């Protein structure tokens, strides 16, 4: 073992770095997009004429931008009073991307009251927080990064551009890696767990029957070490956990974490080229 709980660190260690660049690539393909989206001619013939065809045109771009890129959940435009008045939603497992009639007010949100405190054409981003509807949680669970951008047109506000950035699609498509074997964790800076293999402990911080779910208590004294937002590992005697940090779309850190307990690095003892053929 010693040995072997080191070698595996190591290689946790190496997969981390991977999927960080991965994050990092992904941080940046967001960043262009958005940028395109709020200096797009469609939006801006919109915005100067909203008609019906305007609206189309606008819509079915979106929609265009929504099946291409898969991570964003829904493309909206809402006018300056917080109401949604352009919605295109897409669905990562169909591949279906649509406008919406049902059209909310979301001034009382807090991402909204945030966006309204940015400038015109300065984009910037909410926390990681689940979708609701009408103040309701959406079901299933939609953990969403939201990138926000007010609009103007001539210098005046014509209302604010909202990308949700779909981290279960993320989650989906970056945290295994099907060579080295290892599923990646994604906990919050505030110990919660918002990615994991295991479904039950998501989002404690939200979820009552959950709330035991947190680093913190989970491995109190493995927890500093990732705070610290250094790579490294520790090995508490029964689970080796190697914790990277970066950080997504946010000035706050995104932990990513192996955390595999004993039985599970008895195992990758037998690791053989022939195991990963071919699933
Ligand atoms: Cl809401």
Redesign the pocket.
């Given at each position: 073992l010693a040995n072997n709980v080191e070698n595996t660190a190591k290689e946790a260690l190496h997969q981390l770095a991977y999927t960080g660049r991965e994050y990092n690539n992904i941080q940046d393909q967001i960043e262009t997009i958005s940028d395109l989206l709020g200096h797009s001619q469609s939006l801006y013939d919109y915005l100067r004429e909203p008609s019906k065809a305007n609206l189309t045109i606008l819509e079915n771009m979106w929609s265009s931008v929504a099946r291409n890129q898969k991570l964003y959940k829904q493309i909206r435009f809402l006018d300056t009073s917080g109401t949604e008045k352009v919605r295109i939603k897409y669905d990562f497992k169909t591949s279906i991307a649509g406008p919406s009639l049902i059209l909310?007010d979301?001034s009382?949100?807090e991402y909204f009251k945030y966006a309204q405190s940015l400038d015109n054409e300065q984009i910037s981003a909410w926390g990681i927080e689940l979708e609701?509807?009408?103040?309701?949680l959406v079901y299933p669970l939609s953990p969403s990064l939201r990138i926000l951008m007010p609009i103007s047109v001539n210098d005046v506000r014509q209302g604010y551009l909202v990308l949700n950035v779909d981290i279960e699609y993320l989650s989906s498509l970056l945290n295994y890696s099907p060579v080295r074997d290892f599923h990646i964790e994604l906990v919050k800076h505030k110990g919660f767990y918002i990615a994991s293999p295991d479904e039950s402990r998501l989002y404690g911080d939200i979820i009552p029957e959950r709330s035991q779910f947190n680093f913190s208590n989970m491995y109190p004294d493995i927890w500093p070490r990732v705070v610290s937002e250094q790579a490294g590992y520790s090995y508490s005697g029964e689970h080796l956990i190697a914790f990277s940090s970066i950080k997504f779309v946010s000035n706050e850190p995104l932990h990513l974490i192996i955390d595999l307990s004993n039985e599970q690095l008895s195992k990758r003892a037998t690791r053989d080229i022939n195991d990963l053929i071919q699933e």
């Open positions: 909310r979301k009382a949100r609701r509807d009408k103040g309701e």
